[PDB]
């Protein structure tokens, strides 16, 4: 991917 953004442990935006 590389589009998903990891904000923190166990959490992300733009995930699939």
């Amino acid at each position, epitope marked *: 991917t*590389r*589009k998903s953004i990891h904000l*923190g442990p166990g959490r992300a935006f733009y995930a699939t």
Partner: antibody
Amino acid sequence: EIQLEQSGAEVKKSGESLKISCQTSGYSFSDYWIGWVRQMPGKGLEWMGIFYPGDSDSRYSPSFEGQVTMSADRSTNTAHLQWSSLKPSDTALYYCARLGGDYEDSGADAFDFWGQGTLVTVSS
Amino acid sequence: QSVLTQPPSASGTPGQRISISCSGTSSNVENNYVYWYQHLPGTAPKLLIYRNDHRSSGIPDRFSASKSGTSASLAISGLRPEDEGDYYCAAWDDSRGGPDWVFGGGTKLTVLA
């Protein structure tokens, strides 16, 4: 080796349009967010937004939404930032940076590779 | 909520340990990953630390970081003249329920020449 190369210094008059550039190398351009960061003279770094070349997705910081436009040319691996009406307060060093790190198999989280910056001076 | 506060200035002499401070909120520093950047004259910002306390490759091990509650700090020991520059914390903030990236205000480190 991953490099971002930004266009040269610009000296503009207020009210003028400007498009600046950031050309990438070393990796799949479509696959990583590109971010823009502003530094006004004597001030700190300030996040503007991220643009995703693969599908033209975007997120603007609230202060920058409607004030500037991010885009990307996939024929030339070039990310752009543009103003239709430059203001004196747009006088700044502007950085382009990749959101990566590759700390896991998937995803991105930190601005890892940075352009050398492009200086814009705007006077009325 | 989307503000990281840093002292504007810090100074030390060659050899010393200094600690650059960054104060955020529950919206960023307490739960989201913190990153640290160094910014020297004529060079783009440089990633020093990622995910709170992991040193980036190539970075010297006299650079360290940690996190407790809404505060983050960057330790630099063996302070060298080359370290003189601006140091920023950074984090994702989710006040808008979105991935907003926030830089701290920066700390201008003087290595006493």
